[PDB]
Amino acid sequence: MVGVTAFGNFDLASLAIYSFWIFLAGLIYYLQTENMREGYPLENEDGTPAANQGPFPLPKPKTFILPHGRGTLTVPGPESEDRPIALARTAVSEGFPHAPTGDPMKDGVGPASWVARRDLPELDGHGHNKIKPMKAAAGFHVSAGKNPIGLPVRGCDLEIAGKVVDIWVDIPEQMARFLEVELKDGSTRLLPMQMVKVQSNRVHVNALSSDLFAGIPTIKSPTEVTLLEEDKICGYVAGGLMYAAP
């Protein structure tokens, strides 16, 4: 087969490379349309369907079947915001920022944004509450690293906001997922574990000044946290990096 061409310089290695370019163009079209199952159709800033929807069409709907009886999800699908957004235009033209009309930390916009996730706990494979306070899962204990429970929690203003009273653990993943902080009114809040630094004598929360800890959205049950509650808490804390002023 060495040197054998059907025509021109077109040998069997030419046939291969040209066949691959056809396969690659087909695969890239498949990959991009798969990635249009969330967030499409595209919208104008007012919320109406944009006249330009781009070159790729929407894929045909697929249905995911959710475990533990929680129903089925079809994607793509009707995909409203399902909540108020406290933003106003800063320009009549498209493509400019929208400024917060009130307090963006509490209105939940920009880096403080949160999504209307399901107001139920995430479940493990057996169907237990995946995340629990560690006191509520008797075998668990801090097996290494500085145990934070009992440390004071310091804000970026360098003042003490509260103390750590429990760790909330991911049970199947066996990892620390939140610190529970007891404030100076004895009501608690959850802090995301990725937002805190467990120093030798303190927990430092670089996102929040010590006054902002009362604004952390509180959980409705003291023994579980819903996916909606997680998003509100995690969004609020991360919003502080932009919006916590000195």
Binding site: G39, Y40, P41, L42, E43, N44, E45, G47, A50, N52, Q53, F64, I65, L66, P67, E79, S80, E81, I85, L87, T90, G95, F96, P97, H98, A99, P100, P104, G108, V109, G110, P111, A112, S113, V115, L123, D124, G125, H126, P172, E173, M175, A238, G239, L241, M242
Partner: protein, 281 residues
């Protein structure tokens, strides 16, 4: 046009330079100060490549090649037709890549996410600057850099490698390859495992991360976990590029001979150098 969820995130601020002067979007693309800088350098570098194609006298994109100054020019300037265009395009590439990282830092600030992405990209920039800047400056000539050309930069890889024999014997090059192969293994596995849970057998419910843990423990007796795998994929990629840069910064600066001859230090350890038999006895 917006994603259906996008509007609530398009707030002002997070810009590092320029305030609101460039705090706007152009279609999907965020601009900002460094987006202006990025586009300028990108467009200039691309256009100087097309002009170099005119000077070279080819329009086949696979033959277009912008060579660095010859070794006679040292680290000084060269004529534009004879290495000076390469030098300006190298400035534009550096300006574009650095501006692109800094534009990513601004987008991280506006979305309130960690800085892991621009930090990871800075490793690629340092590997580039190792090959075009730091090592040529150590060796004393821009001509030790690689040419900007689709196939001609592979001639530079070949000619640079065979200057030291088989380049497989560079011990840091071996470590870099091990991370590159292991990263590609882990990306195949991670992609497949997540897809196998979200896309089970027909009619079954979506699997949980408990099934993901279970499959790999059943398969190999260990499971790094959802968080561990993303740490691993990041560090394997960054380690690969760190040891790649290391293998080249030593090549032609502290090591000059055939890399295969390096491994004799082990063979000639005096407690066994003279023992008869084997391959080296």
């Amino acid at each position: 046009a917006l994603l259906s969820f996008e509007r609530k995130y398009r707030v002002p601020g997070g810009t590092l330079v320029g305030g609101n002067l460039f705090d706007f979007w152009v279609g999907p693309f965020y601009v900002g100060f460094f987006g202006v800088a990025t586009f300028f350098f990108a467009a200039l570098g691309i256009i100087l490549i097309a002009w170099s194609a005119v000077l070279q006298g080819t329009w086949n994109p696979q033959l277009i090649s912008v060579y660095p100054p010859a070794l006679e020019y040292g680290l000084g300037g060269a004529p534009l037709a004879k290495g000076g265009l390469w030098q300006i395009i190298t400035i534009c590439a550096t300006g574009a890549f650095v501006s692109w990282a800094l534009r990513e830092v601004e987008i991280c600030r506006k979305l309130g996410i960690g800085y892991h992405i621009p930090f990871a990209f800075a490793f690629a920039i340092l590997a580039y600057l190792t090959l075009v800047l730091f090592r040529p400056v150590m060796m004393g000539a821009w001509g030790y850099a690689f040419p900007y050309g689709i196939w001609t930069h592979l001639d530079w890889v070949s000619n640079t490698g065979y200057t030291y024999g088989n380049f497989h014997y560079n011990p840091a090059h071996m470590i870099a390859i091990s991370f590159f192969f292991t990263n590609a293994l882990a990306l195949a596995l991670h992609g497949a495992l997540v897809l196998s849970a979200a896309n089970p057998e027909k009619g079954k419910e979506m699997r949980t991360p408990d099934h993901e843990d279970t499959f790999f423990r059943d398969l190999v007796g260990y499971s790094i976990g959802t968080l561990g795998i993303h740490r691993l994929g990041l560090l394997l990629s960054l380690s690969a590029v760190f040891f790649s840069a290391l293998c080249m910064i030593i090549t032609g600066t502290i090591w000059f001979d055939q890399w295969v001859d390096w491994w004799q230090w082990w063979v000639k350890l005096p407690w066994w150098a003279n023992i008869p038999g084997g391959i080296n006895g």
